[PDB]
């Protein structure tokens, strides 16, 4: 089985042995002390511990190969003139095929972010959004795939005007720097300091104005858990964070955001993204529309994120009040778009990394980024 063009063959059918490709494997960084981590590549106890979780790494890899193949395809056709709805639907149709969507066992982990310009994250269109992608837009494509709740969170920035090339380079190099700094026993604050030093080493000129690239101080990366996009540890992108350490076996989304604005986001625009609170249990609901919607969410999404378009496509309509009810009850949380000031430009790059016992794997690395 070879992949089609456009892609249509599930990743699982491309690897008939069930063994998916590794991402980029890295020796961990040396410690402050100067000692190397070459020993892990080998310490017998570590190779056995690594191999004990092989089925888990393999699930991440299948999801990452889906991510690589979807994003390559997206880059081939994403163009100004398309609506944001057209972009997201075309991306998602392919993602569903290549992940071999199967309820909660394999699917889309969260909505397709396509945040534009001063909006940095958490924008995807709702029904009726007429927004059209423009030549001068700076669009963050952030989409997730999962196999058995093993989530790939990985993102890149699309542009068409070369004026943004150095801003993209800055943020890419900052994200790569974060990825290199990361490791077992590494302090999360140190990762933030390193990212911020790289990002701020860049100056850019856009339409005759100069800027020093600012990390967006109130955005961050995050640990990832099973069916849990944000498992509760934050990876800062500026100095001054927590000295909490990264641990063996954790998984992290190492994302950085750069801006030519204030370097701070606020909530703006209509909300599209929602997710069940992971920590809320069963709550009996008698209100019939509210009950029905929560059942739909439990069946289709569980604790994974969703958006309004994804309810629409299941045949739900006139659900907004019931969705507001679930938010007000604290069962569902809303995740509105996050924007810097009007006229600013924001960029993002992101990978998922596995802190395996024998090495650090940038599982979502491709030949693209
Ligand atoms: C509903 O769909 C999702 C999808 C991903 C996430 C995961 N997430 N959690 N926080 C953030 C993210 C994003 C979407 O990665 C972007 C970064 C943002 O950092 C942030 O807000 N930091 C403040 C809390 C200080 C959440 C919900
Ligand atoms: Co992301």
From Swiss-Prot:
The species this protein was found in: Homo sapiens
UniProt catalytic activity: Release of N-terminal amino acids, preferentially methionine, from peptides and arylamides
Cell compartments where the protein resides: Cytoplasm
Binding locations of substrate: 122, 230
Source organism superkingdom: Eukaryota
Primary location: cytoplasm
Name the UniProt record assigns to this protein: Methionine aminopeptidase 2
Subunit structure: Interacts strongly with the eIF-2 gamma-subunit EIF2S3. Binds EIF2S1 at low magnesium concentrations.
Cofactor note: Binds 2 divalent metal cations per subunit. Has a high-affinity and a low affinity metal-binding site. The true nature of the physiological cofactor is under debate. The enzyme is active with cobalt, zinc, manganese or divalent iron ions. Most likely, methionine aminopeptidases function as mononuclear Fe(2+)-metalloproteases under physiological conditions, and the catalytically relevant metal-binding site has been assigned to the histidine-containing high-affinity site. Also manganese has been proposed to be the physiological cofactor for human METAP2.
Entry EC number(s): 3.4.11.18
Physiological role: Cotranslationally removes the N-terminal methionine from nascent proteins. The N-terminal methionine is often cleaved when the second residue in the primary sequence is small and uncharged (Met-Ala-, Cys, Gly, Pro, Ser, Thr, or Val). The catalytic activity of human METAP2 toward Met-Val peptides is consistently two orders of magnitude higher than that of METAP1, suggesting that it is responsible for processing proteins containing N-terminal Met-Val and Met-Thr sequences in vivo. Protects eukaryotic initiation factor EIF2S1 from translation-inhibiting phosphorylation by inhibitory kinases such as EIF2AK2/PKR and EIF2AK1/HCR. Plays a critical role in the regulation of protein synthesis.
Enzyme class: hydrolase
Family: Belongs to the peptidase M24A family. Methionine aminopeptidase eukaryotic type 2 subfamily.
GO cellular component, one term: plasma membrane
């Amino acid at each position: 089985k070879v992949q089609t063009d456009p892609p249509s063959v599930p990743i699982c059918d491309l690897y008939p042995n069930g063994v998916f490709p590794k991402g980029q494997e890295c020796e961990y960084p040396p410690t402050q002390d100067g000692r190397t981590a070459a020993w892990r590549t080998t310490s017998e106890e570590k190779k056995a511990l690594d191999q004990a979780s092989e089925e888990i790494w393999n699930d991440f890899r299948e999801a990452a190969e889906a991510h690589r193949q979807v994003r390559k395809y997206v880059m081939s056709w994403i163009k100004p003139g398309m609506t944001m709805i057209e972009i997201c639907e075309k991306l998602e149709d392919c993602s569903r095929k290549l992940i071999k969507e199967n309820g909660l066992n394999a699917g889309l982990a969260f909505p397709t972010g396509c945040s534009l310009n001063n909006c940095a994250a958490h924008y995807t269109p709702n029904a009726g959004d007429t927004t059209v992608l423009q030549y001068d837009d700076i669009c963050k494509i952030d989409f997730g795939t999962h196999i058995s709740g093993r989530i790939i969170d990985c993102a890149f920035t699309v542009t068409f005007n070369p004026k943004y090339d150095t801003l993209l380079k800055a943020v890419k190099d900052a994200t790569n720097t974060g990825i290199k700094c990361a490791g077992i026993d590494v302090r999360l604050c140190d990762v933030g300091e390193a990212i911020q030093e790289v990002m701020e080493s860049y100056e850019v000129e856009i339409d005759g104005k100069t800027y020093q690239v600012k990390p967006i101080r109130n955005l961050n990366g995050h640990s990832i858990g099973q069916y849990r996009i944000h498992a509760g540890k934050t990876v800062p992108i500026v100095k001054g964070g927590e000295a909490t350490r990264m641990e063996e076996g954790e998984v992290y989304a190492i994302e950085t955001f750069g801006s030519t604005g204030k370097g701070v986001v606020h909530d703006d625009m209509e909300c599209s993204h929602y997710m069940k609170n992971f920590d809320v249990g069963h709550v009996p609901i008698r209100l019939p529309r509210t009950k029905h919607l929560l059942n739909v969410i439990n069946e289709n999404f569980g604790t994974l994120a969703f958006c309004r378009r994804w309810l629409d496509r299941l045949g739900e309509s006139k659900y907004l009040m019931a969705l507001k009810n679930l938010c007000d009850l604290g069962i569902v949380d809303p995740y509105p778009p996050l924007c810097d000031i009007k006229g600013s430009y924001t960029a993002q790059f992101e990978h998922t990394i596995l802190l395996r016992p024998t090495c650090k794997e940038v599982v979502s690395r491709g030949d693209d980024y």
